[PDB]
Amino acid sequence: HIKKGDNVKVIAGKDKGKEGKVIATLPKKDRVVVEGVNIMKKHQGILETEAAIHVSNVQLLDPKTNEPTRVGYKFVDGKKVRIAKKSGEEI
Template identity: 55%
Template sequence: MQKIRKGDRVVVLAGKDKGRTGEVIKVLPKEDQAFVSGINIVKRHQRQTQTQEAGIISKEAAIHLSNLAIADPKDGKPTRVGFVEKDGKKVRVAKRSGESIDG
């Protein structure tokens, strides 16, 4: 089971965006990477197509999962993730506050 999933609020632990928070847009489990909204923005040259015009666009690049931590639901600070079984289901729990991360 993954510790970081699409839709999670995460805090960046290392790199140029250290300390910033964002929401996970996409996770690549085989590469251990994730795309986070507003984090690790890069500029790319875009060729003109029928639907898009040419120019330099900004978009999110992948960031390694080791550089991300789940934001605690209580105070938004980075926390580690544990797993607890509730009603026969495996639920993610924040180690910092003990609160459930999954709805």
């Protein structure tokens, strides 16, 4: 659904409306780490680190107008491509 290094928007949670770059992925549990989201404080001094959120809480913005949208698959070329729902432009 969301690949590593793509740009997404937080749709739900405590940081709703925060653009970031995915920098990690956990497909086994469906969780993804997005930079600047879910910062947590650990005890071991206090080392602040970023927690992983649910993959169903982030959306990909349109390339042209930066609008959160769903991903489609036209599959014209021999390799399938990700197509933005709002506009056919590839995401």
